[PDB]
Motif scaffolding. Sequence first.
Motif, PDB file in Angstrom:
ATOM      1  N   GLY A 255       0.771  -1.229   0.000  1.00  0.00           N
ATOM      2  CA  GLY A 255       0.000   0.000   0.000  1.00  0.00           C
ATOM      3  C   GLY A 255       0.804   1.281   0.000  1.00  0.00           C
ATOM      4  O   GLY A 255       0.385   2.263   0.620  1.00  0.00           O
ATOM      5  N   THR A 256       1.944   1.312  -0.685  1.00  0.00           N
ATOM      6  CA  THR A 256       2.743   2.527  -0.788  1.00  0.00           C
ATOM      7  C   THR A 256       2.925   2.950  -2.245  1.00  0.00           C
ATOM      8  O   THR A 256       3.977   3.454  -2.641  1.00  0.00           O
TER       9      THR A 256
ATOM     10  N   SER B 199      -6.421  13.565   1.018  1.00  0.00           N
ATOM     11  CA  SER B 199      -7.570  12.710   1.291  1.00  0.00           C
ATOM     12  C   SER B 199      -8.727  13.509   1.876  1.00  0.00           C
ATOM     13  O   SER B 199      -9.883  13.309   1.488  1.00  0.00           O
TER      14      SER B 199
ATOM     15  N   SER C 198       1.824   3.459   5.991  1.00  0.00           N
ATOM     16  CA  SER C 198       1.930   3.356   4.547  1.00  0.00           C
ATOM     17  C   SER C 198       0.998   4.365   3.885  1.00  0.00           C
ATOM     18  O   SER C 198       0.256   5.099   4.544  1.00  0.00           O
TER      19      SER C 198
ATOM     20  N   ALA D 154      -1.608   3.562   2.002  1.00  0.00           N
ATOM     21  CA  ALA D 154      -2.979   3.104   2.196  1.00  0.00           C
ATOM     22  C   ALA D 154      -3.452   3.330   3.627  1.00  0.00           C
ATOM     23  O   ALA D 154      -4.657   3.482   3.861  1.00  0.00           O
ATOM     24  N   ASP D 155      -2.526   3.356   4.591  1.00  0.00           N
ATOM     25  CA  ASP D 155      -2.910   3.583   5.981  1.00  0.00           C
ATOM     26  C   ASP D 155      -3.537   4.961   6.166  1.00  0.00           C
ATOM     27  O   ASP D 155      -4.454   5.130   6.978  1.00  0.00           O
TER      28      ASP D 155
ATOM     29  N   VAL E 156      -5.350   6.744   3.971  1.00  0.00           N
ATOM     30  CA  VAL E 156      -6.735   6.722   3.507  1.00  0.00           C
ATOM     31  C   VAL E 156      -7.620   6.013   4.518  1.00  0.00           C
ATOM     32  O   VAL E 156      -8.746   6.446   4.790  1.00  0.00           O
ATOM     33  N   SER E 157      -7.128   4.914   5.094  1.00  0.00           N
ATOM     34  CA  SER E 157      -7.907   4.208   6.104  1.00  0.00           C
ATOM     35  C   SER E 157      -8.101   5.074   7.341  1.00  0.00           C
ATOM     36  O   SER E 157      -9.149   5.013   7.994  1.00  0.00           O
TER      37      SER E 157
END
Length: 262
Positions: free
Chosen positions: A59-60, A170, A193, A195-196, A198-199
Amino acid sequence: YIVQAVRGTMATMSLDDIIGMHDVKQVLHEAVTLPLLVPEFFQGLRSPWKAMVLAGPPGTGKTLIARAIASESSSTFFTVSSTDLDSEKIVRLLFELARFYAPSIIFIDQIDTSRRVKSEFLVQMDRRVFVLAATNIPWELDEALRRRFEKRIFIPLPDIDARKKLIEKSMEGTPKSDEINYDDLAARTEGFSGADVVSLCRTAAINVLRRYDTKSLRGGELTAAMESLKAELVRNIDFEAALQAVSPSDTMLKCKEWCDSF
């Protein structure tokens, strides 16, 4: 035949829609975009690489940077997951339509991951077609693959400056208070990361829903309490609630010891 799932992988983004990866960008730019644009310079001793691997944490940004280069180099994009979960009747069409539709880039995810599958892959790997590979665990060898991929690029996690620009990117479009500190968020998201982030933001955005009295159950009927949700802002308390829920993913240094050495 009747396997139009390859057209469900083709394409015909932007390199500045990506934050950071400044080193990774110049590498892929010199390796893919420039050779197509000055072929007289990139021939012989300067012949372009025909394939390389992107190795880093999950997720990078590996798929985004893959699609971006295809956009900058005007390449038709082919995206494929390494999940055949009969299967081999696609690669000899993928590579066929890849060579057929001019220059193309084939991005395949998780090469670490149906029996005689690598057969037709190597039997089709061994005009221009550039294959871009990504794996989370480059320790997994299968030297029949580690041989056919000479260039191994380590793509890392964002630094605090790239983190803040991600966190702001984001949160755009979403209603929020101005009391939010993106510098503090960036500092407190060390080890996260891409993706982290966005989460994190997807969580704090819905923590607005959790701070609401859920007894406004309703269902089927629209309530003033539900039209009240549209006015609600994401606040620091949401990011505080998010930071204690979203955790990251010595763990990622193995890709340095693998890309920089053998």
